[PDB]
């Protein structure tokens, strides 16, 4: 509208060419400004046809995501599960009641993938924060100790307790992480072994070794597969709960899955 | 040479060590990073009430980048402090700000995605128009520039949320204020900077006392800087006391000295002299109120508890309601109290409940709702108490206002809360509410303690403290009452040099006439006036009296004479 | 030093002494140098009325600098002023950029100084300021600062206020007597402490527009210059300044003297110059006002609470109009509020206006909003007998404690006002039943706190000639545009009495009755001829009416 | 409403609050079961709920504690034990 002014002279030089259809001029503008700037100038608005674009539903947002679930999966070196897509397309409509559907859904998936890639970095979350906190309490107890005062006696006696009882949890989280990191050698090593068993069944059938054919098909190979299954799990691709963690960190409504840290608190709420 | 005269380098500034050592807030830095590392629409905006450290997070991110503690795709990005005050400033022509903005954008997008940008107070981005701060909107929603921002709640809502199609390209990071423990941590972290600036020393007890007082007495600003300002103020005052004046470190009571030097609250640890005055209270208050030994002890004990350190910090400093016969000294006791702990009789806030016999007249002490005549003016009582948060509220003769005004005090008491028109909140936590009455009128203590019950409600009588009953005027002590009145009169006779020689029989006849059993000592000041002041006025402008003469009085058989 | 053409220095010219020493106000300097020595929220701002010494304090600090007494942190740091009326649409921001860049590349702590910066603040100095390289010391007034630095600022978090209200009489006297020799060589006449103190007190009391430290110097220098020009008396004195104050305000040098004895002794016919007869009432009221300001009555009471009633048209109001004229120097001061609409129970809230948010709130009450401004009025109360017996409670509260409460929440003060409760009771009784009716109708104890309750004595059938005579002396001024004089004749003048009294509204019509007659009966002669500006215009009493 | 058996725990809670508020001046109390049950025995008049108990705690402990505290002899640190008497309770 106001291309160059000083008294209207510019911005309507294309008003003559529009009518004869010389130029085609496809354009897209928001809805609460088409009646704030253009509609005020109904001499020019007349040359425009409107194509109302309604917001899609969850069923179509799921499809949009399923199609777009490659660019992010590539830009970040991670993988994405379809459960994440569905859970995002549902929670983004249930909770974030301020924006519209095709976008507030994609944002959750994108942030989840970004966080996951940031965790394949040196250390995962919930341990880096504890070690930073331990270093803080250390640098604090070191400089509060040299207090030629008396009011610092009972104030420092608890800081030692807190430092020790957070360092304990640091060491425990460290040990559990080392366990879970050393667990992905066997489960997979067996396969490194299970693949060897598949080569063995190949060669059993090469040599006419029927006796080994089934011993590998119904014995060794499936037995190794069953060994991996052993106990059903109670971190290389996003899941339908990192979405919940993002929707909890933003619009601080808590919507996780009660990750065993507080279910005792809920069952204790009365007392 | 485009973003060289419209921008500095915050990263190089942090490399030169000239920034402050942020302490804590790892959650928000991690959130800002995992937002700034997205694929499209990567622009976080730090939101939160003003003063809580919305820039400190950005300096923290800069320091972390310089130190090298960030993920793989965030190293060596050199965040830039952009500014628009020096782009829209000098331009008087058509299309001149556009060339500068386009030069800046072009210089950004020529280099690779390693010029992460930072506009502070970006509520100054919607103007510049006359089609400005709007051409910059295609680049935003494609991940070309990063544009870390920082804006207050109010300015955000007022300036951006009116432009929805632009607010979409942003992400909010609610930076809530920290608690007392985190504040103590931050203060202990920053201690050394001030300890070096001012050549003094600062004690950890002083830091703790600052972080605790700045939360209980200044309830209009926010913590992470509301606390630091006190430490700075006290360090500066100690420096000035050291210099220019021919046991050199701040203490945990200098902070109380500051936080009492403004806001008027006497918060402290009972420095000397003050304790002598408090111990010497019942008698020091007796020189203005004779009798009522039961009441003075109660108010004195209230003040004693409140200032000694044993009293619920969230409830008023007392909510007494004393009532009794007419003309006994209730309002006068309240005024004498206010004169005791202020030495300013006109520094209390008395409201006359005798006016509020009408229902709707309550609006004077509350305000009016949004959309009505007097809205931006506020409420009388709330305005008077929002400043001077140490007064002595009074409710003269609260028996007239029909039983609806009793439903505002009902929650003024027991919490010290009140909400005016604008939706604000005020604190009555360190005032002394006092509300007289005249129930009874002759009846015994068990005939007036029925009037109280049948007039008010249980939910009300349960709120306020002891219901003091006032005795009747003893027929003897009126001599001392007349003594007080003559002392006040002599004090009025000080511009001249007159004195009085009041005789004992004159004083006796005075205390004898004008104390009728139904109205107490009320018809005494007017009698003193009409029997001394006017008689002297007719006797001074017409000679025969001059300043210096120790005027005596007589007990002539008729009305009193000189 | 590249663009130092919109900036003046304070330490350079201090190295010569072209400034004035600022003895006094040594607290403010310490406060300022303390604020400027912090780490955050430095660079204070001086807040006070105009011509109070804002520039005086900063110059005193500059001189203490050039001498050297402050902490060595602030030592060896100069100051530079700025004038904004030289910068000012556009290019003001360009020159702002130039000067700010100059300060920035100066690479030091060269303090600035920006007078009345409420025209500057905007967003161009905050990125410069929240970095710690420049130090600006500004100044403005209180309400103005409350305007430009509170609504559109968001910057008040980096500005520290400093208050300088006003010096007192004793202080500006010291200021004057310090700043005396400079003029004794500029003109050079002589100076007297009597003249100095007279200037101070008289300016403070009567020049109620400007303020003290510059107001006193203005008058002193003006009188000195006038007495140097007069040689076209080698000293200045109290009269030598009272003459100037009289020439300035309009009030002559006479009344500008002792205001107790020579005033309370003027309660004589100076009233009777406007009122006629009723000398008893004038004497009673004069005694009441004399004894009231003695200095022994209680400090919370109206300056007078008397009432007068009886026959109308005798000049009941005229007494009050002359009374306010003599005391408060104006007859457009009394405020008449009729007690007629106040015959209903609810309408008593009209003269206050109770709630915020109801019909009458912004207009305020009839009584208070006309008293809280001009707290020197003389309130009148017509037909006090018809007012409902609830306003009398308000009146009680007035004349039992000199304060009242409006609806806005304010407190109005009544300790130096005068109440007057007119009426019309006593139509049949002379002095016997009028007092009984006044006792019975009103509450007989409310009357006790009143002063004398005098009744105006009727007009003598002879003593209408005096009122009509003042009337004629007045109307003689009417046709001063053509200098046509007028005639007098006892038959004609007394002819007005028996035909203009009409004893139900005194001499209400006695102005119009005669003015329309004489004026519009001669107005045709004044266009045809028959008169010129020496003619007595002899008007006579024709057989029936007043022709010429 | 409340039962006299339920006010004992309320007394415990009020005393915990008062001790936590006193820990700012590094004091604490040692209350004997005589006084602990005496206070609840003064939780009378089952019409005003449980606020009378709070005003009682104030009137019976806080005034005397302040009176001692600002008159020396109770210098910061050492704890004071409260012990019941025939009618009131002394420190
Ligand atoms: N976590 C923190 N670590 C160190 N200093 C902090 C921290 N939080 C706040 N501060 C200090 O507290 C003050 C806060 O100032 P800023 O955060 O710069 O103001 P702001 O947060 O931008 O608020 P506005 O909107 O600009 S008024 C500064 O002195 C900071 O150094
Ligand atoms: N013990 C006392 N000491 C000093 N003055 C007293 C005492 N008892 C009464 N008076 C005087 O009695 C007069 C009335 O006191 P007020 O307190 O103002 O009346 P009041 O208590 O408000 O009674 P009501 O119900 O409001 S009329 C004042 O002049 C007091 O000085
Ligand atoms: N304590 C003082 N010592 C010496 N001179 C003073 C003192 N106070 C005031 N003055 C003189 O009174 C004059 C006051 O004028 P200004 O300094 O312009 O006033 P201001 O404080 O700047 O406020 P404005 O702008 O005039 S309303 C100065 O010229 C001083 O010479
Ligand atoms: N005593 C008087 N002295 C001078 N003028 C008087 C006197 N009595 C009456 N008047 C004249 O009467 C006019 C109107 O009388 P006024 O007092 O206004 O009426 P009312 O007394 O009924 O209120 C005055 O303007 C004045 O001209």
Distance of alpha carbon B190 from alpha carbon D76, whole angstroms? 30
User: Long-range contacts for C202-210 (Cβ within 8 Å, ≥24 apart)?
Assistant: C202/C241, C202/C242, C202/C245, C202/C256, C203/C245, C204/C169, C206/C245, C206/C249, C206/C251, C206/C256, C207/C245, C207/C248, C207/C249, C210/C51
The last residues before gaps in chain C (C-N over 2.5 Å) are 88, 121, 232
Radius of gyration of chain D (CA): 14
Q: Exposure pattern of C106-140 as b/e (b: 16+ CB <10 Å)?
A: eeeebbbbbbbbbebbebbbbbbbeeeebbbbbbb
Q: Contact C387/C430 with Cβ under 8 angstroms?
A: no
Distance of alpha carbon C305 from alpha carbon C290, whole angstroms? 14
Method: cryo-EM
What letter would DSSP give residue C73?
T
Structure tokens at B214: 């700045």
Q: Is the CA virtual torsion B478, B479, B483, B486 positive or negative?
A: positive
Residue appearing with tokens 């010389």: A22
The residue nearest atom 6 of ligand 4, judged by CA position, is: C315
Structure tokens at C340: 């007629």
Q: How far is the CA of C344 from the centre of ligand 4 (A)?
A: 30
Q: Considering every ligand atom, which ligand is closest to the CA of C22?
A: 3
All residues at 6 or more sequence positions from C447 whose CB lies less than 8 Å from its CB, including other chains:
C438, C439, C453
User: Long-range contacts for B447-453 (Cβ within 8 Å, ≥24 apart)?
Assistant: B448/B323, B452/B323
Continuous H helices in B83-167: 97-110, 137-140, 153-159, 164-167
Tell if the CB–CB gap between B374 and C362 is shorter than 8 Å: yes
Distance of alpha carbon C147 from alpha carbon C3, whole angstroms? 31
**Chain C environment of B384 (Cβ under 8 Å):** 409
Among candidates B120, B145, B134, B122, which has minimal Cα distance to B58? B120
Q: Is B389 in the pocket of ligand 1 (CB under 6 A)?
A: no
All residues at 6 or more sequence positions from B299 whose CB lies less than 8 Å from its CB, including other chains:
B318, B320, B333, B337, B432
What letter would DSSP give residue C378?
E
B39 vs A2, A75, A103: nearest CB: A75
Task: Report the chain C residue with the minimal C-alpha distance to residue B538.
Answer: C291
Which residue in B30, B39, B182, B192 has the most chain A C-beta atoms within 10 A of its own C-beta, making it the best mutation to test that interface? B39
Q: Contact C287/C430 with Cβ under 8 angstroms?
A: no
Distance of alpha carbon B75 from alpha carbon C283, whole angstroms? 98
Chains that touch A (3 or more CB pairs under 8 A): B
Distance of alpha carbon C371 from alpha carbon C379, whole angstroms? 9
What letter would DSSP give residue B62?
H
Question: How many interface pairs between B and D have CB atoms less than 8 angstroms apart?
Answer: 44
Q: Which residues pair with D89 in a beta bridge?
A: D84
What letter would DSSP give residue C483?
T
Query: Three-state DSSP class for C214?
Result: helix
The H or E element spanning position B202 is strand B201-202
Q: Considering every ligand atom, which ligand is closest to the CA of B488?
A: 2
Distance of alpha carbon B438 from alpha carbon B442, whole angstroms? 10
Are chains A and B in touch, 3+ Cβ pairs below 8 Å?
Answer: yes
Q: Contact B123/B155 with Cβ under 8 angstroms?
A: yes
* φ and ψ of C403, to 5 deg: -165, 160
**Chain D environment of B275 (Cβ under 8 Å):** 70
The residue nearest atom 16 of ligand 2, judged by CA position, is: B329
Q: Considering every ligand atom, which ligand is closest to the CA of C220?
A: 3
Q: Is C221 in the pocket of ligand 3 (CB under 6 A)?
A: no
The H or E element spanning position B149 is strand B149-151
Q: Contact B36/B174 with Cβ under 8 angstroms?
A: no
Q: Which residues pair with C418 in a beta bridge?
A: C378
Q: Contact C116/C47 with Cβ under 8 angstroms?
A: no
Distance from CA of B452 to the nearest CA of C (A): 27
List, as one string, the DSSP characters of B400-467.
Answer: SS-TTGGGTHHHHTTT-EE--TTS--EE-TT--EEE-----SS--HHHHHHHHHHHS-HHHHTTS---
The last residues before gaps in chain B (C-N over 2.5 Å) are 130, 246
Among candidates C523, C454, C60, C54, which has minimal Cα distance to C278? C454
Q: Contact C272/C418 with Cβ under 8 angstroms?
A: no
Distance of alpha carbon C14 from alpha carbon C506, whole angstroms? 75
Distance of alpha carbon A161 from alpha carbon A159, whole angstroms? 5
Among candidates B26, B31, B38, B47, which has minimal Cα distance to B116? B38
Task: Report the chain D residue with the minimal C-alpha distance to residue B461.
Answer: D48
Measure Cα distances from C454 to C123, C146, C305, C433 in Å. Answer: 70, 52, 12, 14
Distance from CA of B501 to the nearest CA of C (A): 17
Distance of alpha carbon C199 from alpha carbon C237, whole angstroms? 9
Structure tokens at B255: 């902070």
* φ and ψ of B261, to 5 deg: -65, -30
Burial tier of C540 (Cβ tally within 10 Å: 0-12, 13-18, 19+): exposed
**Ligand 4 atom nearest to C471, measured from its CA:** 27
Distance of alpha carbon C119 from alpha carbon B308, whole angstroms? 50
Report chain C residues touching chain B, CB-CB < 8 A. 30, 34-35, 37-41, 69, 71, 89-91, 93-94, 96-97, 122-124, 126-127, 154, 157, 290-291, 294-299, 354-358, 361-362, 405, 407-409
Range of the domain at C59: 7-163
Measure Cα distances from A96 to A71, A88, A250, B378, C63 in Å. Answer: 24, 11, 9, 36, 64
Distance from CA of C299 to the nearest CA of B (A): 9
Q: Report yes or no: A154 at the B interface, CB cutoff 8 Å.
A: no
All residues at 6 or more sequence positions from C489 whose CB lies less than 8 Å from its CB, including other chains:
C538, C539, C540
Q: Exposure pattern of B478-503 as b/e (b: 16+ CB <10 Å)?
A: beebbeebbeebeebbeebebebebe
| Beta-strand runs (E) in B293-348 | 319-320
Strands B417-418 and B201-202: unpaired
Distance of alpha carbon B241 from alpha carbon B250, whole angstroms? 11
Distance of alpha carbon C456 from alpha carbon C311, whole angstroms? 7
Among candidates C203, C179, C217, C184, which has minimal Cα distance to C23? C179
Residue C479: how many other CB atoms lie within 10 Å:
18
* φ and ψ of B252, to 5 deg: -75, 5
Q: Exposure pattern of B351-378 as b/e (b: 16+ CB <10 Å)?
A: bebebbeeeebbbbbbbbeeeeebeeeb
Q: Is the CA virtual torsion B184, B189, B190, B192 positive or negative?
A: positive
Distance of alpha carbon B406 from alpha carbon B450, whole angstroms? 18
The residue nearest atom 12 of ligand 1, judged by CA position, is: B225
Distance of alpha carbon C148 from alpha carbon C157, whole angstroms? 14
List, as one string, the DSSP characters of C258-315.
Answer: -SSHHHHT--STTTTTTS-S-HHHHHHHHHHHHHHTSS-S-SSS-S-EE--BSSSSSS
Distance of alpha carbon C411 from alpha carbon C402, whole angstroms? 10
All residues at 6 or more sequence positions from B504 whose CB lies less than 8 Å from its CB, including other chains:
none
Binding residues of B: 48-55, 324-331
Q: How far is the CA of C471 from the centre of ligand 4 (A)?
A: 11
| Beta-strand runs (E) in C157-224 | 160-163
Structure tokens at B62: 């800069």
Structure tokens at B448: 């007036």
Structure tokens at B292: 């009522």
| Beta-strand runs (E) in chain A | 79-80, 237-238
Q: How far is the CA of C213 from the centre of ligand 3 (A)?
A: 6
Q: What share of chain C is helix, strand, coil (3-state, %, to 5)?
A: 40, 5, 55
C476 annotated to bind ligand: no
Residue D45: how many other CB atoms lie within 10 Å:
7
Among candidates A154, D24, D45, which has minimal Cα distance to B312? D24
Structure tokens at B209: 């006392």
Q: Contact B149/B45 with Cβ under 8 angstroms?
A: yes
Distance of alpha carbon C411 from alpha carbon C392, whole angstroms? 19
Among candidates C131, C123, C125, C135, which has minimal Cα distance to C100? C125
Q: What's the angle, vertex CA B292, arms to CA B287 and CA B297, rounded to 5?
A: 80
The H or E element spanning position B385 is helix B380-386
Burial tier of C496 (Cβ tally within 10 Å: 0-12, 13-18, 19+): buried
- CATH code for the domain in which residue B83 is found: 3.40.50.300
Residue C357 CA to chain centroid, in angstroms? Answer: 32
Q: How far is the CA of B149 from the centre of ligand 1 (A)?
A: 14
Distance of alpha carbon C390 from alpha carbon A27, whole angstroms? 74
Tell if the CB–CB gap between D55 and B308 is shorter than 8 Å: no
**Ligand 1 atom nearest to C40, measured from its CA:** 29
Query: Three-state DSSP class for A172?
Result: helix
Q: What's the angle, vertex CA C227, arms to CA C224 and CA C229, rounded to 5?
A: 110
Among candidates B206, B191, B190, which has minimal Cα distance to B251? B206
**Start-to-end C-alpha separation, chain D:** 33
Q: Which residues pair with B320 in a beta bridge?
A: B434
Q: Tell me the structure's resolution in angstroms, rounded to a single decimal.
A: 7.0
Q: Is C58 in the pocket of ligand 3 (CB under 6 A)?
A: no
* φ and ψ of B377, to 5 deg: -85, -35
Distance from CA of B462 to the nearest CA of D (A): 6
Report chain B residues touching chain D, CB-CB < 8 A. 270, 275, 278-279, 301, 304-305, 308-313, 458, 461-463, 465-466
Distance of alpha carbon C334 from alpha carbon C376, whole angstroms? 9
Residue appearing with tokens 């291309």: A3
Binding residues of B for ATP: 48-55, 324-331
């Amino acid at each position: 509208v106001g291309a160059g002014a000083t008294a209207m002279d510019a911005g309507n030089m294309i008003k003559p060419m529009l009518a004869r259809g010389e130029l085609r001029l496809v354009g897209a503008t928001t809805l609460d400004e088409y009646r704030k700037h253009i509609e005020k100038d109904a001499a020019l608005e007349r040359r425009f046809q409107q194509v109302y674009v309604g917001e899609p539903s969850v069923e179509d947002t799921i499809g949009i995501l399923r199609g777009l679930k490659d660019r992010y999966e590539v830009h970040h070196g991670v993988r994405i599960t379809d459960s994440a897509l569905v859970a995002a397309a549902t929670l983004s409509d249930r909770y974030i009641t301020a924006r519209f559907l095709p976008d507030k859904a994609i944002d959750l998936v994108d942030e989840a993938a970004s966080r996951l890639r940031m965790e394949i970095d040196s250390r995962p979350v919930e341990i880096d924060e504890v070690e930073r906190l331990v270093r803080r309490l250390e640098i604090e107890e070191m400089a509060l100790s040299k207090e030629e005062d008396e009011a610092s006696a009972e104030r420092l006696a608890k800081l030692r307790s807190e430092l020790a009882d957070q360092k304990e949890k640091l060491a425990e989280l460290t040990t559990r992480w080392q366990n879970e990191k050393n667990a992905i050698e066997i489960v997979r090593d067996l396969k490194e072994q299970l693949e060897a068993l598949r080569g063995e069944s190949e060669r059993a059938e090469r040599d006419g070794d029927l006796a080994k054919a089934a011993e590998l098909r119904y014995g060794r190979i499936p037995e190794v597969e069953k060994k991996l299954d052993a106990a059903l799990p109670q971190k290389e691709e996003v899941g339908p709960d990192d979405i919940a963690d993002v929707v909890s960190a933003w619009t601080g409504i808590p919507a996780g899955r009660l990750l065993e840290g507080e279910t005792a608190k809920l069952l204790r709420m009365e007392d | 040479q485009a973003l060289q005269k419209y921008s500095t380098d915050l990263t190089a500034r942090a490399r030169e060590g000239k920034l402050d050592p942020v302490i804590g807030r790892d959650n928000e830095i991690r959130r800002v990073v995992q937002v700034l590392s997205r694929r499209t629409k990567n622009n976080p905006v730090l939101i939160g009430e003003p003063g809580v450290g919305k820039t400190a997070i950005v300096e923290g991110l800069a320091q972390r980048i310089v130190a090298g503690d960030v993920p793989e795709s965030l190293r060596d990005k050199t965040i830039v402090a952009l500014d628009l005050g020096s782009m829209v400033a000098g331009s008087k022509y058509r299309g001149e700000f556009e060339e500068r903005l386009k030069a800046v954008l072009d210089d950004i997008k020529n280099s690779a995605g390693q010029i992460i940008t930072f506009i502070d107070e970006l509520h100054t981005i919607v103007g510049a128009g006359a089609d400005a701060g709007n051409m910059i909107k295609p680049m935003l929603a494609r991940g070309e520039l990063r544009l870390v921002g920082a804006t207050t709640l109010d300015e955000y809502r007022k300036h951006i949320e009116k432009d929805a199609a632009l607010e979409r390209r942003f992400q909010q990071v609610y930076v809530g204020e920290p608690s007392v423990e985190d504040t103590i941590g931050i203060l202990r972290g920053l201690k050394d900077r001030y300890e070096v600036h001012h050549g003094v020393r600062i004690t950890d007890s002083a830091l703790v006392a600052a972080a605790t007082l700045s939360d209980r007495y200044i309830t209009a600003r926010f913590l992470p800087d509301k606390a630091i300002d006190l430490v700075d103020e006290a360090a500066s005052r100690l420096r000035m006391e050291i210099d220019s004046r021919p046991k050199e470190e701040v203490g945990p009571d200098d902070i109380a000295d500051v936080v009492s030097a403004w806001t008027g609250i006497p918060a402290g640890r009972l420095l000397e002299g003050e304790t002598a005055k408090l111990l010497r209270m019942e008698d020091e208050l007796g020189k203005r109120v004779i009798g009522q030994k039961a009441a003075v002890t109660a108010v004195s004990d209230a003040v004693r508890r409140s200032r000694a350190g044993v009293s619920d910090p969230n409830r008023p400093t007392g909510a007494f309601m004393f009532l009794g016969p007419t003309g006994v000294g209730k309002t006068e006791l309240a005024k004498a109290l206010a004169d005791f702990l202020f030495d300013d009789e006109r520094a209390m806030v008395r409201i006359d409940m005798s006016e509020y016999g009408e229902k709707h007249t309550v609006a004077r002490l509350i305000g009016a709702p949004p959309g009505y005549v007097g809205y931006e003016a506020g409420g009388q009582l709330t305005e008077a108490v929002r400043r001077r948060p140490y007064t002595v509220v009074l409710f003269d003769e609260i028996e007239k206002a029909h039983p609806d005004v009793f439903d505002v005090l009902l929650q003024v008491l027991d919490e010290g809360r009140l909400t005016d028109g604008h939706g604000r909140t005020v604190d009555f936590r360190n005032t002394i509410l006092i509300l007289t009455s005249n129930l009874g009128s002759g009846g015994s203590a068990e005939q007036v303690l029925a009037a109280v019950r049948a007039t008010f409600k249980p939910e009300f009588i349960n709120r306020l403290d002891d219901v003091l009953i006032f005795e009747g005027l003893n027929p003897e002590e009126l001599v001392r009452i007349v003594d007080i009145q003559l002392a006040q009169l002599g004090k009025r006779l000080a511009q001249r040099r007159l004195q009085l020689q009041v005789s004992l029989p004159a004083k006796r006849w005075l205390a004898q006439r004008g104390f009728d059993p139904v109205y107490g000592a009320r018809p005494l000041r007017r009698l003193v006036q009409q029997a001394i002041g006017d008689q002297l006025a007719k006797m001074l402008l017409a000679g025969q009296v001059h300043d210096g003469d120790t005027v005596p009085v007589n007990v002539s058989p008729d009305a009193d004479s000189l």
